[PDB]
């Protein structure tokens, strides 16, 4: 989503530039039916994006819950 937000910003810049060149007569929606840049829209993620994202996301469970499920397994599987 971050890497594709980057492409969104890039296309926003392109459409703003075109609007500046012309009489600012079209929005992004009209731009996408009048004009198309398929290859430009092909988002390709570079792992820099991964190294950005990994700093921001929390684990889905705390140690408190995980120890609980570990004990559950120990009871049922440890024998």
């Amino acid at each position: 989503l971050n890497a594709m937000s980057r492409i969104a910003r890039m296309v926003e810049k392109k459409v703003s530039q075109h609007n500046e060149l012309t009489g600012e007569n079209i929005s992004t929606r009209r731009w996408f039916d009048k004009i198309a840049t398929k290859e430009d829209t092909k988002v390709v993620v570079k792992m820099e994006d991964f190294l950005k994202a990994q700093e921001q996301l929390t684990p889905s469970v705390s140690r408190a819950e995980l120890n609980h499920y570990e004990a559950v397994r120990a009871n049922f599987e440890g024998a």
Binding site: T58, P59, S62, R63
Partner: protein
């Protein structure tokens, strides 16, 4: 709220009983009815009809008394917060207990 009384109530001197029209009846001496009498006569005499009586005496508004921010300062000592440190402590947990 504290301000709207300026335009409507007008300290009972700035918009109501503003002057010349305060006493148009004569010196009442037949009976002691003084204030209620004049109020009744004023209500009765206000039989005129008008429509779209717009006015913009305000700075940039229609039919209102703009609040003086200096007077708005008088409202800070009345309104109240909701106070709890328990909530502050409790928010430690929902986001990975700020530990995991």
């Amino acid at each position: 709220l504290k301000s709207v009384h300026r335009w409507l109530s007008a300290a009972d001197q700035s918009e109501v009983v503003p002057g010349n029209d305060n006493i148009e009846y004569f010196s009442i001496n037949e009976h002691g009815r003084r204030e209620e009498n004049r109020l009744r006569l004023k209500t009765l005499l206000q039989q005129d009809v008008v429509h779209e009586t717009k006015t913009s005496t305000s700075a940039a508004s229609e039919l209102t008394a703009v609040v003086t921010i200096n007077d708005l300062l008088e409202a800070c000592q009345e309104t109240k917060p909701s106070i709890s440190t328990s909530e502050l402590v409790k928010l430690r947990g929902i986001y990975d207990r700020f530990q995991k």
